[PDB]
Design an enzyme around this catalytic site. Structure first.
Site, short mmCIF file in Angstrom:
data_model
loop_
_atom_site.label_atom_id
_atom_site.label_comp_id
_atom_site.label_asym_id
_atom_site.label_seq_id
_atom_site.Cartn_x
_atom_site.Cartn_y
_atom_site.Cartn_z
N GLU A 88 0.07 -0.92 -5.07
CA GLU A 88 -1.11 -0.09 -4.87
C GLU A 88 -0.76 1.30 -5.38
OE1 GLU A 88 -1.87 2.63 -2.07
OE2 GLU A 88 -3.07 2.90 -3.90
N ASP A 128 0.86 -1.17 0.00
CA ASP A 128 0.00 0.00 0.00
C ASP A 128 0.90 1.23 0.00
OD1 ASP A 128 -2.46 -1.80 0.48
OD2 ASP A 128 -1.39 -2.03 2.40
N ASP A 150 -11.59 -0.83 1.31
CA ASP A 150 -11.95 0.50 1.78
C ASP A 150 -13.20 1.03 1.08
OD1 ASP A 150 -9.83 0.93 3.70
OD2 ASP A 150 -8.46 1.32 2.02
#
EC number: 2.4.1.25
Length: 496
Positions: free
Chosen positions: A336, A289, A391
């Site tokens: 990501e 991430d 998310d």
């Protein structure tokens, strides 16, 4: 080179089963079978580290440690090491508070039962494990033991000699919490043992596990406590600067400690090499991430309260990947790369042939230029396409809240790609089809979209204080028909 294939995203906590959480047991093997039977070749998980307040996998007590809550206790209970009862756990949801109160005591009781009753063969492999993993395990086990003894206070809030890791204090703490240190070590041994079997089963079924790791660790973590020089920390151990993202009109101030990259570069990036090597034991591929951080990171002074105040700093991504490539013969990273991105960040990712993320829910707010629209996907195909992320909301929940533009543009676009739907529950399936028809080598879909669940099944709602990370499958919910529908789609999109 990634195969043209499909996967499903499911975090192990969401697995069905007794005792209030999904564990590394029979239900996980069942899921793998379903994934196998459905013709999927990839299982994606969120970070597997120990969780604090807020129960977020993305804020962990250890980069190296496994989640104690994912340990299956039933093998212990069959051996008679522990007796398990249900305190009133909810079904379809994780109640972390009940889980905290019941499981940790359950684990301690098991440990005592093992130490008394276990065969010497078992007690040797636990002993051998502690010596092998000591380089991370010694600190982790002590960090947890100290944490309970210091009432959940952060290490930054601990007494100074312990905080600074003076040798005498470390020695005396270990002796004082030796039973506690042993216990936390046992939880890990169980975790790694149970995941090792699980990974074996996956590989047999031709399933690769996609792992997840945040680029930045948490401030309250064993590694930060253990290696303060690696982090930008004051005398108190308070971060001098904090991780964040620039103005999102506010920007975001995450608070995570930033790496002294120079120090790591001197060290041959040892922390990262170790971090990846440990991840590679659990996973086949590792998504990172905020992958952009490797190119450059936004540095906010800790004294500054907002995201607007900081500066950008260059980071040696190139060098780190060169070391990785030379160590492992490969760079097994999914990037990501969502949100604001730069040509520099793209340059790095493409240089190491790293695959990037695509999310279909993002795709219909703009025009045809939108990058998340399949026609704009790169021909090299090194992308993983998602209907939505952990998310984001479920596709059905998203469709219920989406704009008239989004809804109309979607339907039209699908129609052009030969995909039609008559119902809102069909919308997730249509979008899954859109991703499968795309050039993307991997299409990874959350199980909530397979089931066409609404917003009640959202894993994480950013800006919502409670109810996050709790969604769970019900037993039997993932029916054979769901699997047969996926397999047909994969045959039709050449993902078999």
């Amino acid at each position: 080179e990634l195969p043209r294939a499909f996967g499903l995203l499911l975090h192990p906590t969401s697995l069905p089963g007794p005792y209030g959480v999904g564990v590394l047991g029979q239900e996980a093997r069942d899921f793998l079978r379903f994934l196998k039977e459905a013709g999927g070749q990839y299982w994606q998980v969120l970070p597997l580290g120990p969780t604090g307040y807020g129960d977020s996998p993305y804020q962990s007590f250890s980069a190296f440690a496994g989640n104690p809550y994912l340990v299956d206790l039933r093998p212990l209970a069959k051996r008679g090491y522990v007796r398990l009862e249900d305190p009133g756990f909810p079904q379809g949801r994780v109640d972390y508070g009940l889980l905290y109160a019941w499981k940790w005591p359950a684990l301690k009781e098991a440990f005592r039962g093992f130490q008394e009753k276990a065969p010497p063969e078992e007690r040797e492999d636990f002993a051998a494990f502690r010596e092998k993993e000591a380089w991370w395990l010694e600190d982790y086990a002590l960090f947890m033991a100290l944490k309970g003894a210091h009432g959940g206070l952060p290490w930054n809030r601990w007494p100074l000699p312990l905080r600074k890791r003076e040798e005498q204090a470390l020695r005396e703490a270990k002796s004082a919490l030796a039973e506690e240190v042993a216990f936390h070590a046992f939880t890990q041994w169980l975790f790694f043992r149970q995941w090792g079997a699980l990974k074996a089963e996956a590989e047999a079924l031709g399933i690769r596990i996609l792992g997840d790791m945040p680029i930045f660790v948490a401030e309250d973590s064993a590694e930060v406590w253990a290696h303060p020089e690696w982090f930008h920390l004051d005398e108190e151990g308070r971060p001098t600067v904090v991780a964040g993202v620039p103005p999102s009109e506010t920007g975001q101030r995450w608070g995570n400690p930033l790496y002294r990259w120079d120090v790591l570069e001197r060290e041959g990036f040892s922390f990262w090499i170790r971090r990846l090597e440990k991840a590679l034991e659990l996973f086949h591929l590792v998504r990172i991430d905020h992958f952009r951080g490797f190119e450059a990171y936004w540095e906010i002074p800790a004294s500054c309260p907002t995201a607007v105040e900081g500066r950008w700093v260059k980071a040696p991504g190139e060098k780190l990947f060169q070391k990785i490539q030379e160590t492992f013969g490969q760079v097994p990273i999914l990037a990501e790369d969502l949100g604001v991105i730069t040509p520099e960040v793209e340059a790095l990712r493409d240089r190491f042939g790293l695959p990037g993320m695509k999310v279909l829910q993002f795709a219909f707010d703009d025009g045809m230029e939108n990058p998340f629209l399949p026609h704009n996907y790169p021909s090299h195909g090194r992308v993983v396409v998602y209907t939505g992320t952990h998310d984001n909301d479920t596709t059905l929940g998203w469709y219920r809240t989406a704009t008239p533009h989004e809804k109309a543009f979607m339907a039209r676009y699908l129609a052009d790609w030969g995909i039609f739907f008559r119902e809102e529950e069909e919308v997730p399936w249509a979008l899954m089809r859109l991703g499968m028809k795309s050039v993307a080598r991997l299409a990874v879909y959350p199980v909530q979209d397979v089931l066409a669940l609404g917003s009640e099944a959202r894993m994480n709602y950013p800006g919502r204080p409670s109810g996050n990370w709790a969604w769970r499958l019900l037993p039997g919910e993932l029916s054979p028909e769901h699997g047969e529908r996926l397999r047909a789609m994969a045959e039709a999109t050449e993902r078999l």
